[PDB]
């Protein structure tokens, strides 16, 4: 019935019992969470301690409870505080909510440091964990087989590599006309979304060569690149 | 269809947020417009 047993099993001493409650909470975490938020601070203390090999599991559980309360912001932060088991969350259907929050946070910071150096993805401030969550999103997009999804999130975060990969994959030549349309949607959308000179330059240069490689593409779309960047070399 | 029912809360958050902003903006600008015209 109630959660009251579960709460008690944590507080009671000896390692084994504490370890056991974590698994128990996880089973009913979505169903029942009202009573378990009482003991939210305690769950956090078990993570700090290194004796449990299920510390990672302890951070994972608390984060589901925050999300459920209604506190989406509290959830993602806790999840990223630990930097443990975001992989599970990314591919979980019911909570793609806190994932959205992590994505929304990352793209802003990523934009700032792009101006400074084009690659900054493995820099100390932009934790490699953040880079990993982001690429997991890109794979989810192509699984639903929409590539607009994958493009649009990456333009916001000033990612040069991910965009380059996308344009390159459309060199399959599934059909030539059909490849051009997707490319044209991004060049119009660049004008408006991107205001940063450095990032804007870099992306148009890439797009020139991928188009240029197909001798079969319209030169209206190639013209459009030449004029925007307004480069004498292109 | 089944896949997209599950993955929806990523997408749904951002678009529904944005729409709410339009509803409150229109409301405000036209209320203040009436005040300005009278004075």
């Amino acid at each position: 019935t109630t959660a009251a047993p579960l709460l008690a099993l944590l507080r009671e001493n000896q390692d084994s019992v504490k370890t056991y409650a974590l698994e128990s909470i996880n089973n009913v975490v979505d169903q029942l969470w009202s009573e378990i938020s009482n003991e939210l601070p305690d769950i956090e203390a078990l993570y700090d301690d290194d004796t449990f090999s299920d510390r990672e599991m302890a951070a994972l559980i608390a984060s589901k409870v925050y999300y459920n309360l209604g506190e989406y912001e509290s959830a993602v932060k806790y999840a990223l505080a630990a930097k443990d088991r975001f992989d599970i969350d990314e591919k979980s259907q019911f909570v793609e909510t806190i994932v959205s929050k992590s994505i929304e946070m990352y793209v802003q910071e990523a934009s700032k440091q792009y101006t400074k150096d084009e690659q900054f993805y493995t820099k100390d401030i932009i934790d490699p964990k953040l880079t990993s969550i982001f690429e997991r999103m890109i794979e989810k997009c192509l699984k639903a087989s929409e590539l607009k999804l994958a493009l649009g999130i990456a333009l916001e975060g000033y990612r040069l590599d991910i965009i380059e990969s996308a344009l390159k994959s459309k060199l399959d030549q599934d059909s030539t006309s059909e490849n051009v349309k997707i490319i044209n949607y991004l060049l119009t959308l660049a004008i408006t979304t991107v205001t940063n000179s450095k990032f804007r330059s870099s992306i148009l240069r890439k797009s020139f060569d991928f188009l240029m490689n197909m001798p079969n593409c319209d030169y209206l779309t190639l013209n459009k690149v030449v004029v925007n960047l307004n480069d004498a070399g292109l | 269809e089944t896949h997209e029912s599950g993955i929806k809360p990523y997408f749904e958050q951002k678009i529904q947020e944005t729409e709410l902003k339009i509803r409150s903006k229109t409301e405000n600008v036209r209320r203040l417009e009436a005040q300005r015209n009278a004075l």
Partner: peptide
């Protein structure tokens, strides 16, 4: 509901 999701990236970002 695959259709709505696409529009967030394209149209609505500009608006």
């Amino acid at each position: 509901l695959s259709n709505v999701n696409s529009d967030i990236y394209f149209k609505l970002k500009k608006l």
